[PDB]
Design a protein around this ligand. Structure first.
Ligand code: NA
Length: 457
């Protein structure tokens, strides 16, 4: 029932895309996501090209191009017939240092996106004596985490079909990114979204907008200055957090992690309140009968949450209030950025959008999009090519830092691992050691409290 035909033509910018162009990043064409896959049997360049041809024909948004001269951004979905992706194949069988070759070339390709003409997809095959490595980089304008899951699924499906001598045949298309974006433009001025204005107005009015404290005053810090500091919970405490701690107050893991975040910022920053940038997948059921379940694009939603850091006691009430705070947000928070970037000024009430969070928090769950098929797995030579916090190759070193503290959590090897990413221009390493140790302490206290509370009741 969704459009199975070729999608082409102009596409309105969605909120996160308007955010992106509004930043006017240095080296705007180098702002990507990437991955490296490994197949011990080896990959065939001819099969890879056949499957990628079908993938990019099928997932129309990957054919997007962007004009932006004098700030006049035009997003256009190309039809078929042009360059669908850039493909390179390398014989590394003679090389002593395969890792060096892969990092150099993946970095070269990351820096080679032509936004105006495309393609926005780079593919490189590295053949070795011990299996082959397949690099993919895609500009972020046309992709997101869920989209990568879809792409890995379809790559596995098409490759298996090719190996079996069968025609490549992907799942039916869901609704186009073009159509989705057009529908969002309509939604932006309709009654359901406008009904949220009092909520968002209340948030803005409560937001004090006090500077997140930094160690040093610096302007135009760049990605090259960013450092990552990691803490983790052992498997025992991770399992308690995932499978037992939520019973006390019937929470989700994110509620407890956000509660910990408030406690840590209360201790470390001494602020009375803090606004945090959260993210949603953005594929919410806001458009009647829309279906973007297998649609490739940048759907990600960003929204603010206000944490009260004054009233952190008793811990029981603080956890319950954090849960309640999260439950009261309308429509998983998708509305605020639509109001900000798309809604007509006349429809936006008294919203001023002065809320500019410097802290982002994202809990990503389990780490495994690239590891569901027997055909390939995550490459041990992935290096700086990832979809997450360790993807040092994804952004230009001269790209501007856009968040002071980017905090991400994920489960790897049965352990919760939290990464605190910051600019070394703005903070001493010791300051972030203090924050991350505070976070760890408060999260452990929350887990202990929840286990005892559920015993008590
Ligand atoms: Na989140």
């Amino acid at each position: 029932k969704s459009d199975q035909g070729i999608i082409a033509g102009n596409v309105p910018l969605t909120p996160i895309q308007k955010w992106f162009f509004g930043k006017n990043f240095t080296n705007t064409g180098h702002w990507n996501q990437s991955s490296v896959l490994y197949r011990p049997e080896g990959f065939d360049p001819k099969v890879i090209q056949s499957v990628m041809d079908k993938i990019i024909e099928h997932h129309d948004a990957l054919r997007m191009v962007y004009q932006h001269e004098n700030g006049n951004v035009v997003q256009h979905n190309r039809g078929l017939g042009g360059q669908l992706y850039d493909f390179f194949s390398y014989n590394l069988t003679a090389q002593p240092d395969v890792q060096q070759a892969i990092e150099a070339e993946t970095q070269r390709l990351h820096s080679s996106m032509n936004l105006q003409e495309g393609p926005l997809v780079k593919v490189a095959l590295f053949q070795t004596l011990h299996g082959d490595h397949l690099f993919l980089a895609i500009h972020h304008l046309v992709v997101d985490g869920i989209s990568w899951r879809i792409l890995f699924e379809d790559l596995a499906t098409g490759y298996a079909q090719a190996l079996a001598g069968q025609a490549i045949s992907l799942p039916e298309k869901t609704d186009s990114f073009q159509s989705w974006s057009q529908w969002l433009q309509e939604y932006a001025n309709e009654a359901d979204l406008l009904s949220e204005i009092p909520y968002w107005e209340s948030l803005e009015s409560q937001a004090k907008n006090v500077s997140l404290p930094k160690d040093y005053e610096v302007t135009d810090c760049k990605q090259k200055s960013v450092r990552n500091m990691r803490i983790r919970l052992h498997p025992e405490e991770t399992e308690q957090l995932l499978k037992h701690a939520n019973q006390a107050y019937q929470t989700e893991i994110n509620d407890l992690l956000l509660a910990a975040l408030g406690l840590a910022f209360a201790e470390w920053s001494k602020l009375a309140q803090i606004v945090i940038h959260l993210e949603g997948h953005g594929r919410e059921d806001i458009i009647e009968q829309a279906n973007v379940a297998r649609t490739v694009g940048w759907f990600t939603s960003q929204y603010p949450v206000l944490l009260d850091l004054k009233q952190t006691a008793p811990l029981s009430d603080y956890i319950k209030l954090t849960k309640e705070n999260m439950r009261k947000i309308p429509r998983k928070g998708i509305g605020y950025d639509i109001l900000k970037h798309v809604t007509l000024p006349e429809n936006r009430g008294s919203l001023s959008f002065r809320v500019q969070p410097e802290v982002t928090f994202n809990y990503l769950g389990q780490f495994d999009a690239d590891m569901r098929t027997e055909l390939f797995t995550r490459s041990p030579y992935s290096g700086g090519n990832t979809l997450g916090a360790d993807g040092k190759n994804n952004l230009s070193p001269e790209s501007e830092v856009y968040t002071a503290l980017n905090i991400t959590g994920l489960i790897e090897g049965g352990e919760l691992v939290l990464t605190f990413s910051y600019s070394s221009e703005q903070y001493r390493e010791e300051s972030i050691q203090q924050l991350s140790q505070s976070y760890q302490k408060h999260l452990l206290a929350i887990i202990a409290h929840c286990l005892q509370s559920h015993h008590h009741h």
